[PDB]
């Protein structure tokens, strides 16, 4: 579909990955909502655009995606002042990872919270109003390659919910067809982010009981490294892959061995 | 890890794969717990096993996997009455498919909570005592080869869970081996089983809103095919699985290709 003269709500667009992509549809005549829960993230976005007189066409909206009723209300804020969207890009995401005996209940919700029904939310809230108005759309939901690859422990929760996003992309392709949606599952390798504030970005209400701060704090001084692609590279990826209806998108090709090799041990558990 | 003497603690104990995983490692040796949401399917398990003269060795606990307190008196109930157990089987499952622009937030949550929050229930309420008392142990979840192979929209709930159940079972291994746990993602094709009263099975707090009732209706009239596979060769395959520590198990091939194309795919999308 062309991007010309569309709208695309973003979630963590304020940010990375997100960032990347806002750039890069912006660039190709998209008018943009960025959605985040970070207001600092938001304001930083906001003047970055500004600077560069874009502002008219960007809105930002401070939510949690894994809030319901916010997102409920996003997608009316979006369609009154902006509207649309055509472009759903469910893109948001944290690290919930860490020794795997010091997870908690607090950290598996969280974890699936954000990560798997924050998409599933933007599915719910924003694809009866693309179906309606019947002008097709597109919608970009981000995993992982975490979610392919096989991953160990530490990383149980996050590629857990991942490889559940990979599916769900999978799943609907069908059913959003049928009102000329098409959906594409992003899935990264590394890329230079600010990701490393999860511990930063987690809910207040997942919180009290959490048994993986420390994990978190840890995270919060990895250093982000300068061989990691940039996000207006995985942007550019991403138009492509709208403009050309694309199911998958993979950023690196550094896992295909270890993928090929998870896929021939399912195939040989097959009689 | 060696089966006999062991308690085995299975969810969906009481009906289809997991009375046959049932039948199956009590003849070699187990001592069983039965958890089910269903005290008509427990009654029938238990007349089944007294008529064997086999009841002093079967223990029933009526339970909701996703009620995270039910799992853990379910954890205390099983170590005091029938010991540990060594062996973890979370098999319970439902059926949430149905018209994709039908299903409600119910619809997800339901689904969701069962195929996959069960699981980790059972990991979360289950494991510390298996790690602490020392003697080893097995974990095997229950997904479907609907969470590997493309899937349609009317199954999104559904692959979407199976999915993620297969990337958990992967991502725990290492830390449960820490404790000489292993584990086992089993994925079936069709098995005769009771999953078509699944409508019967919705806990109380997801019925009101749900969008799927009418599909839950005609799901309960669905004829068994006489092809399908019997759950007793389902439970050898799994005793085999326990006993030599494998990962994966697959009930049926047909599936293969569809896989295979579905991998290329993803391998293609990588750079
Ligand atoms: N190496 C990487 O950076 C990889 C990133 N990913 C995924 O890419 C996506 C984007 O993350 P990055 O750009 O790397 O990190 P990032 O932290 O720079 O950007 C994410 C943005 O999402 C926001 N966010 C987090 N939780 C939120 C919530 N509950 N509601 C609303 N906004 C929320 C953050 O505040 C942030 O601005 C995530 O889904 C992540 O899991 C996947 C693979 C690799
Ligand atoms: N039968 C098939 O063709 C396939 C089945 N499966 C999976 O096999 C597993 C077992 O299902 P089946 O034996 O086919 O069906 P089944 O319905 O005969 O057995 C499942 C049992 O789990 C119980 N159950 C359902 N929800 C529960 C809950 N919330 N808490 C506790 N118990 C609950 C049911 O009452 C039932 O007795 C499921 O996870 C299912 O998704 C996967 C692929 C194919």
Redesign the interface.
């Known amino acids: 579909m062309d991007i010309a003269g569309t709208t695309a709500f973003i979630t963590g667009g304020a940010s990375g990955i997100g960032f990347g992509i806002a750039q890069r549809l912006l660039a190709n005549g998209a008018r943009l909502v960025l959605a985040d829960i970070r207001q600092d993230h938001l304001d930083e976005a906001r003047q970055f655009f500004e600077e560069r007189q874009q502002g008219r066409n960007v809105h930002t909206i401070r939510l949690d995606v894994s809030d319901?009723a916010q997102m409920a209300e996003a997608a009316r804020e979006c369609e009154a002042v902006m509207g649309g969207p055509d472009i759903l890009i469910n893109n948001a995401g944290i690290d919930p990872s860490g020794p795997?005996?010091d997870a908690t209940?607090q950290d598996?919700d969280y974890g699936?919270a954000i990560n798997?029904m924050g998409p599933?939310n933007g599915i719910?809230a924003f694809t009866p109003g693309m179906?309606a108005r019947g002008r097709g759309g597109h919608i970009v939901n981000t995993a992982s390659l975490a979610?392919?690859t096989?991953?160990?422990?530490f990383?149980?929760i996050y590629?857990?919910?991942?490889?559940?996003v990979?599916?769900?992309t999978?799943?609907?392709?069908?059913?959003?067809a049928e009102d000329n949606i098409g959906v594409t599952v992003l899935?990264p390798g590394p890329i230079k982010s600010r990701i490393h504030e999860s511990g930063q970005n987690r809910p207040e209400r997942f919180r009290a009981g959490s048994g993986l701060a420390e994990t978190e704090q840890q995270l919060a001084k990895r250093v982000v490294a300068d061989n990691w692609m940039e996000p207006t590279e995985v942007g550019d990826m991403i138009v492509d892959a709208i403009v050309h209806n694309?199911?998958?998108?993979?950023?690196?090709?550094n896992?295909?061995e270890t993928?090929?090799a998870?896929?021939q041990?399912?195939?040989?558990?097959?009689?």
């Open positions: 319901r795997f005996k209940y598996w699936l798997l599933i719910m179906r979610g392919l096989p991953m160990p422990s990383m149980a590629a857990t919910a991942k490889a559940a990979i599916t769900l999978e799943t609907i392709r069908d059913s959003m899935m694309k199911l998958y998108v993979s950023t690196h090709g896992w295909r993928c090929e998870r896929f041990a399912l195939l040989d558990s097959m009689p």
